[PDB]
Amino acid sequence: QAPIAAYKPRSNEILWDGYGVPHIYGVDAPSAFYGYGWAQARSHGDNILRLYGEARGKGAEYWGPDYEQTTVWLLTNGVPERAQQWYAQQSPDFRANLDAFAAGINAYAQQNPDDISPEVRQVLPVSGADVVAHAHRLMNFLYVASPGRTLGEGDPPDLADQGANSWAVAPGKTANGNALLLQNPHLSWTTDYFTYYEAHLVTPDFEIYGATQIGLPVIRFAFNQRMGITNTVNGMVGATNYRLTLQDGGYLYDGQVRPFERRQASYRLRQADGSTVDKPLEIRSSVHGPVFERADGTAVAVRVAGLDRPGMLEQYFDMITAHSFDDYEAAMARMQVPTFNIVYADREGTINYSFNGVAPKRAEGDIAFWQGNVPGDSSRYLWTETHPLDDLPRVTNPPGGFVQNSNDPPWTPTWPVTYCPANHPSYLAPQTPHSLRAQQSVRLMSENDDLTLERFMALQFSHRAVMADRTLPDLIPAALIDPDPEVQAAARLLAAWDRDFTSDSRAALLFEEWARLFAGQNFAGQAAFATPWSLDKPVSTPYGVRDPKAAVDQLRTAIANTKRKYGAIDRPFGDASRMILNDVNVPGAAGYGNLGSFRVFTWSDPDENGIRTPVHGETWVAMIEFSTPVRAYGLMSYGNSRQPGTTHYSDQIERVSRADFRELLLRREQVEAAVQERTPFNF
Fold it and tell me: Residues 150, 276: one domain?
């Protein structure tokens, strides 16, 4: 019936468990945020202070050369100053929480100066504005508008490997009648701002368990006794790069030569000897927005949407603390979160999918057109309005009894679908072939019924080489008629494979190498299938091999590659695939999502000895059943801390190698039973 009574904290304290997971208890909100800020300082202080410093545009001043590009990017886009505005524009209530958070961080550093790396001490003290600045940078100028896209360069490995999985199951599809939720982000294992942190906040008025990126005062992947939500990247096109026609010191626009908006700014660049050199920086703007110059000499102006949405953090906070789905939807309706697909589920039995973000209203052009260089010489392409929530693809309690997204276009959020590409403007999302992992996603959910939490988790462990199922039947035969015995031996090895990425697979590695050539290095190539992908058979296409003879030459080559990389065509998958953190070295399993593996581990290239580890992949994984009280399990691949000397960095990877999940503790008693360290505090 009613949720179990939440705990009313009678004093401020952090109860840490054996895994470095803080259970922050505050007599009020500001107190809790302060504890949260303290805990994050404890667990990831160095990187948070580094990121906050960058967000001030002081990256070059504080750490020199390797941080300069980001400084120029953030200054030119006026990020540090807008953070001050956004900060000021906060609601009095929330601004107090942000100030607490910053005080928590400051406090921790004050009482533990030794735990703070020397090179980041100059960043202290930090303020509520700094928090806001970072989140603004992350959301708007990393996720939505990255310097790579605008500068016409690219980005260090983050192509399609910035993915995730997400499921929400309606009570009707379960055995117990409680909704189920899956949080499963697949971001880099090394990039600092992408590091996830696990925490638990409790005040007399709210409770929030979950993971979030270091430096964020709100929990993005949260849940509690009442509800929970998860996120996945949808690539919402919130920015436009306009090509400019330079002319007579200005730029051509609507037939006339408009002069630029010029501002002479400056920043400090640290020198090897510790001194700083003052460096000039002219910031030019066009009616579109800031202007950058590419290497090829192209003058590009970037127009980022939602620069007037200062309530990002508060939206997330109100969303996750919502007392009902209605409240939740009202919160999301503020349009303060610029991107992401978001999934919801609660103890009431409601599940929801939302292609969220702030999208510019446009009158022409498909997504591909808007993702490229839009002509910047006419007011014809200068958008100003953005779409309301109800203009975007969304699903609630569908007939299928579930929702899901694995970075695939929003065209198959459930089965049967409830809408189609035609119902929305063609610039919102792409209409491209869904990845094999995404197809596996729809299958695992729609094909199963009467689910239990345990079965639900087991399905999450799927590591099927769907790619094989679509190709081997045609490849194998064609390869067997090849005169080269080694090729024939390869075909037999492959045909004996159960087509699952297990540690012991002797054919997996070889298959991958073949697939690299058959479907491109990222495994997304379609040019080689006999039957092209189709939205009408979204989970069974593409299929077959268009040119078996060619594909065999590819296998011929792939065989050489496998031996060169691993030393044999039949090396055990988990012998070359390892998960190495600190001094822990465990065998790997599961693999590339584009090859159909639901559970993901994007293996890196192998080293001298054919050993390789995950570059991106599983990180924070949790499955929640909204029973009363709720039940949840989770694991954090890379622990809950990265502070030099911490015992909580490599202390979970072993359980990951065995899919041995931790029961997430929400109830006071459970917490008291697992406490290993108490940190009392006053705000």
Answer: no
